[PDB]
Design a protein around this ligand. Structure first.
Ligand code: HEM
Ligand SMILES: *[C@@H]1O[C@H](CO)[C@@H](O[C@@H]2O[C@H](CO)[C@@H](O)[C@H](O)[C@H]2NC(C)=O)[C@H](O)[C@H]1NC(C)=O
Ligand code: NAG
Ligand code: NAG
Ligand code: NAG
Ligand code: NO2
Ligand code: NO2
Ligand code: CA
Length: 595
């Protein structure tokens, strides 16, 4: 018995049950519950929220309020003692390319975004948080521990603002606070096309009727398209180099320019849409723009689905894949396709896969110029290195030929993210993504590690020795007990990521369970899943079965040598074959028989 429809923010229910295409918002996918999976709704709760006061205050908020009898440790202290390391030697994943990391980020961005509240809308309250390190309302600063090096150079805290939540935004909502997912839960290329109508429209080229996405008019990549710039200010991408004055890209997702390899991946995706729109016009010149946009959008969405479920998930989940994501059996309208709050933390395992450097490689997969290799932190919000320093081709080559970082219980997150992160409006390369993650799962009222172990049918260690056995690591176990004092209090992000990885995968048991279930649900509860009877023709699906990340690159760059299995660790020229030996996507089956 509780409020059973607090859905005032955004009440669109404007459904056509005939339509053969997805809405932009995700609405109308589920017929019986048309808002399921739609953007701008609460994240699903797989377990009840756990706040210090039952309703909204994070654990950690009030000094003298314990969690199960013990103070929760500072996020930055956990970062410093557990998550950090010095030596990047030996940290690379000998069987995952850098594309493996990058595809994770892409998928993540398609599925979830819980942006900071906008209550620092015309308030020095946003600057006062930064300035004076003063907790209150949505300002929840990450305070430095006593012996932190950053205390000496950066003041008392790192700023942090609580995530947006449904119902009111300035006051509270009755029942526990529920954070918003601002993008569509469906794996639907929302990161290319947008999750809101206005953005979706702004991204389109409605000046010609070719059903194209807008492209950059100020720059081109050896005649290939770039994303439009976002001509609004202040621009983080301008801030990081005011000489170059190259703004951020405008994509279907706000976060597209956070790092140069994300921007790169967005760039491939846009080009594929345009290329598909132009093929379809040839095969159907009687098709108008809307029809061309929608049909291209639908192919791209399928492409992302296939890559993710056929190529990516099996080498994340490994032995657990088959357990959580059995072969498809059609749409089930009883499944909840909403992204869970916990999943938005579980999928941050990617953070331990980001290595300290990025390379540009030439057409011989050799170093491109004299600074071919660059530190990751110089590449946050960096578009000028694309526009003015070789286009995406050198970066796409590095994605193929360089390696992801390997999760390591002793080497968890690179200092390029731990210590050198840049965030818009904060001016310095001085933040800590690990700390942010821990603060965020308190912000989101996350149950602790054992609650999730319980949920997944796994043991719940209560002692040091129990923790040691589960983590198979005495020293890590001991550091966690010293900080958290009971495994019940371990933040899920760090707890999940601390578990040794499953056979053939890159996450442990708990994360495999949380991730696997989520991915099962977004497949099974999606009316427009690519393999659902009805969505594509049988001839179309035989065509779509052939897609590969290799063909995506071949079709949309000037690269001509590629691996067959782009997520594996590949070395040139041994594991690189010519683009010609690579299957294409035959759009023959999209010819209509109208005459
Ligand atoms: C250099 C690479 C990357 C950077 C710079 C980066 C940065 C960030 C930042 C700043 C946030 C917001 C944190 C917060 O305020 O709570 C975030 C969230 C997130 N990241 Fe990463 N990240 C990277 C790679 C990845 C990868 C590889 C994955 C997954 C495979 C991933 C998954 C996520 C997810 C799920 C979130 C939560 C999104 C949401 O629901 O709000 N990221 N990341
Ligand atoms: C800001 O961007 C400018 C211009 O893109 C950078 O300058 C160029 O740097 C290259 C090497 O990458 C030199 O070969 C050129 O001579 C420079 N050209 C110009 C326009 O001066 C500059 O290094 C960047 N600064 C920072 C701090 O990132
Ligand atoms: C490398 O990775 C793939 C996918 O996990 C696997 O099939 C292959 O056998 C692996 N090679 C070795 C020897 O680890
Ligand atoms: C839209 O398409 C027309 C015709 O191809 C092209 O000339 C124009 O530059 C495009 N506009 C944008 C901003 O993408
Ligand atoms: C659909 O999902 C529900 C709940 O997840 C499950 O109980 C039911 O068996 C499924 N229905 C079909 C047709 O498989
Ligand atoms: O211009 N915004 O990322
Ligand atoms: O991924 N950027 O917040
Ligand atoms: Ca989506």
């Amino acid at each position: 018995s509780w409020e059973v429809g607090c859905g005032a923010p955004v009440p669109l229910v404007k459904c056509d049950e005939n339509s053969p295409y997805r809405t932009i918002t995700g609405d109308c996918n589920n017929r019986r519950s048309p808002a399921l999976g739609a953007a701008n709704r609460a994240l699903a709760r797989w377990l009840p929220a756990e706040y210090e006061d039952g309703l909204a205050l994070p654990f950690g908020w009030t000094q003298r309020k314990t969690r199960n009898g013990f103070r929760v440790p500072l996020a930055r202290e956990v970062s410093n003692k557990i998550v950090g390391y010095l030596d990047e030697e030996g940290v690379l994943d000998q069987n995952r390319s850098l594309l493996f990391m990058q595809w994770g980020q892409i998928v993540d961005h398609d599925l979830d975004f819980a942006p900071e509240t906008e209550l620092g809308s015309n308030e020095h309250s946003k600057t006062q948080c930064e300035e004076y390190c003063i907790q209150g309302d949505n300002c929840f600063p990450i305070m430095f521990p006593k012996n932190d090096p950053k205390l000496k150079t950066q003041g008392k805290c790192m700023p942090f603002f609580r995530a947006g939540f449904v119902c009111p935004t300035p006051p509270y909502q009755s029942l526990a606070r529920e954070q918003i997912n601002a993008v569509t839960s469906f794996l639907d290329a929302s990161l290319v096309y947008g999750s809101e109508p206005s953005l979706a429209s702004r991204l389109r080229n409605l000046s010609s009727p070719l059903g194209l996405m807008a492209v950059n008019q100020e720059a081109w990549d050896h005649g290939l398209a770039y994303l439009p710039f976002n001509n609004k200010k202040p621009s983080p991408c301008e801030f990081i180099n005011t000489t170059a004055r190259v703004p951020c890209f405008l994509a279907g997702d706000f976060r597209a320019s956070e790092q140069i390899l994300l921007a790169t991946a967005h760039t491939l995706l846009l080009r594929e849409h345009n290329r598909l729109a132009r093929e379809l016009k040839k095969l159907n010149p009687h098709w108008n723009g809307e029809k061309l946009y929608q049909e291209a959008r639908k192919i791209l969405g399928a492409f992302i689905q296939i890559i993710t479920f056929r190529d990516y998930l099996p080498i994340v989940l490994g032995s657990e894949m088959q357990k959580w994501i059995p072969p498809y059996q059609g749409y089930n309208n009883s499944v909840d396709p909403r992204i869970s709050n916990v999943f938005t933390f579980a999928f941050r395992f990617g953070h331990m896969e980001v290595p300290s450097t990025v390379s540009r490689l030439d057409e011989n997969y050799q170093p491109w110029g004299p600074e071919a290799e660059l530190p990751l932190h110089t590449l946050f919000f960096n578009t000028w290195r694309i526009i003015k320093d070789g286009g995406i081709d050198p970066l796409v080559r590095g994605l193929l030929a360089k390696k992801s970082k390997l999760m390591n219980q002793d080497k968890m997150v690179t200092s390029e993210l731990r210590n050198k992160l840049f965030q818009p409006t904060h001016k310095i390369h001085g933040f800590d993504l690990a700390a942010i993650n821990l603060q965020r799962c308190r912000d989101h009222g996350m149950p602790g590690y054992n609650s999730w172990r319980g949920f997944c049918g796994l043991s719940q260690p209560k002692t040091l020795k129990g923790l040691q056995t589960v983590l198979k690591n005495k020293i890590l176990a001991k550091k966690l007990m010293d900080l958290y004092k009971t495994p019940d209090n371990i933040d899920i992000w760090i707890g999940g990521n601390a578990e040794p990885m499953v056979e053939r995968g890159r996450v442990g048991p708990l994360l495999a369970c949380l991730l696997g279930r989520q991915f099962q649900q977004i497949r099974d509860g999606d009316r427009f899943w690519w393999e659902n009877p009805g969505v594509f023709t049988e001839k179309q699906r035989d065509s779509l079965q052939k897609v590969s990340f290799s063909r995506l690159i071949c079709d949309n760059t000037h690269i001509t040598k590629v691996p067959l299995h782009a997520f594996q660790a590949n070395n040139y020229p041994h594991d690189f074959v010519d683009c010609s030996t690579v299957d294409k996507l035959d759009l023959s089956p999209w010819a209509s028989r109208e005459n």
